[PDB]
Paper text:
One such Spy-specific endolysin, PlyC, has been characterized using biochemical and structural techniques and shown to be a 114 kDa multimeric holoenzyme. These studies demonstrated that PlyC comprises one PlyCA subunit, harboring two distinct catalytic domains that work synergistically to cleave two different bonds in the peptidoglycan, and eight identical [name] subunits that form a symmetrical ring for cell wall recognition. Taken together, the data show that the subunit [name] mediates translocation of the PlyC holoenzyme across the plasma membrane, where it is subsequently trafficked and quantitatively lyses intracellular Spy. Nonetheless, our results suggest a moonlighting role based on structural motifs within the [name] subunit whereby a cationic binding groove is a central determinant of interaction with plasma membranes and subsequent internalization.
To explore the roles of cationic residues in PlyC, we mutated the exposed Arg and Lys residues on [name] to Glu in order to independently determine the role of each mutation in Spy binding and lysis, as well as PlyC cellular uptake. Fluorescence microscopy showed a lack of binding of the PlyCBR66E mutant to Spy while PlyCBK23E and PlyCBK59E, as well as a charge-conserving PlyCBR66K mutant bound comparably to WT (left). Moreover, the PlyCBK23E, PlyCBK59E, and PlyCBR66E mutants, but not PlyCBR66K, lost the ability to enter A549 epithelial cells (right). Thus, K23 of [name] is not involved in Spy binding but is involved in epithelial cell internalization, whereas K59 and, to a greater extent, R66 are involved in both Spy binding and internalization. PlyCBK59E and PlyCBR66E that lack the ability to internalize in epithelial cells also lost the ability to bind PI and showed diminished binding to PA and PS. To confirm the PS specificity of [name] interaction with the membrane, we also measured the membrane affinity of PlyCBR66E. As expected, this mutant binds poorly to PS, comparable with WT [name] to PI-containing membranes (compare Figure 5d and Figure 5a). The orange sphere shows the location of a putative phosphate site observed in WT [name] in the presence of phosphate or phosphate-bearing ligands. This site holds a water molecule in the WT structure, but an empty site was observed in PlyCBR66E, apparently disrupted by the mutation. The H-bond interaction between R66 and E36 is maintained in the mutant, suggesting that the observed side-chain conformations represent a stable configuration.
Residue numbers in the entry:
A (entry chain A), B (entry chain B), C (entry chain A), D (entry chain B), E (entry chain B), F (entry chain A), ...: 9 to 70
Write the structure that this text describes.
Amino acid sequence: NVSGVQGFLFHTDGKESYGYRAFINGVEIGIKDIETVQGFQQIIPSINISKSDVEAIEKAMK
Amino acid sequence: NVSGVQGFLFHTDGKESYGYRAFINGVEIGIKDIETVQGFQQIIPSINISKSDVEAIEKAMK
Amino acid sequence: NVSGVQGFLFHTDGKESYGYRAFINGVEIGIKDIETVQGFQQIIPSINISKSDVEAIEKAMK
Amino acid sequence: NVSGVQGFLFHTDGKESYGYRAFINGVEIGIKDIETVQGFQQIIPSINISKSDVEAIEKAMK
Amino acid sequence: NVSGVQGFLFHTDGKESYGYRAFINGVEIGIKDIETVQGFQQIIPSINISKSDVEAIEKAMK
Amino acid sequence: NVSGVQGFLFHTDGKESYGYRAFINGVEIGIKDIETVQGFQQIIPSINISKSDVEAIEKAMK
Amino acid sequence: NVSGVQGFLFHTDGKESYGYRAFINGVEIGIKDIETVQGFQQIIPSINISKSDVEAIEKAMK
Amino acid sequence: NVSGVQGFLFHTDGKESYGYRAFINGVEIGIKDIETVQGFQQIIPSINISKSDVEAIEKAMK
């Protein structure tokens, strides 16, 4: 890993979308633009997380 | 490495399910939705642990 | 290693079986169910240790 | 590893360019010349970040 | 890496055996049973050390 | 990396050449001889940096 | 490296042999038996060092 | 990794030789004999550095 970035993008394909978010070096952020999603997808994984599970993930990525 | 996540998903296929759980960076969580299970299966392993063995694993992961 | 687990399963195929055990991040545990053995075999090695040698291994894995 | 540089180049292809920027060993810089962009592209990744998302990434990389 | 064990087995094939010994995470132990030798041979190397050379190796591994 | 050296050579192919320079374990040096450039090219990357960008790179490689 | 040993065997093929020696985790030792040389050759490199250079190497491996 | 040696050999092929030198675990040494040069070439890189550039490299490796 040469990027200096550890984390992942997350979104849900279920009923109540929250858009795309990411953990970037242990900091959670919202992503506003699809360009940015595509850019980060070059260096970090992009996974699915249900809206109901986001809270628990945040606890673990705290 | 790049995901910023070390850990694993665990469940039992035995007669009394406890659903899916995970250790994520040393923190134990419940996972509510199968979307989230499949998301995390892209970046961390997913193993079987019997209901009777969860206690010892929880203690070892302390 | 993405699991956050270092260690191994151990058992003997000799006269006085002690079932399966494991070292998980330097903590020794008994394993009650074969499901759990199979699960851990996905992420950590599974080796043979004679009953007579368990005591010495415990000293080294202390 | 061998370069002594962890980080990435970022730019947007959107309507209002901010040129190329980089995080180099946790320090954010502007890059003035495309020669330098192509030089750094030999050793670190180069991704797209929208203008609207730069703020959050800057905060996360703090 | 994943085993949580760094070290090696040692023995001599010379005229006076000292059996099998091991350094396991910096701790020297005797191994009593060949089952255990073969178990550990799945995860750590197994080398020859003459009886006359064991002393110096023990000191170096201090 | 077995060399004990992290860094890179840099030069520009643009108007105002500054010759070859390098960062070697976070220390910037001028290189006087092409032999030395060729030698370091065996163990560290060699990239292009415009004269106008050298100042900003020095800030990040400080 | 799973052995827990870093170093090398050394000998000279020149006029004034000093037998085989080794650095084992920064400790210099003489090796008395060829069996031991063969054993260590399974886990660490074996190189040539002239008798005249041993003193300088010892300084660096101190 | 396994050798316990990080560094490199250096020499010039220019008109005034300084022989072979090495940085071995951050310590600069002279090498007297070509046997030793070839021994170390099995485990660490060997590069060219002009006589005029040795000073700057020595300072950088401080």
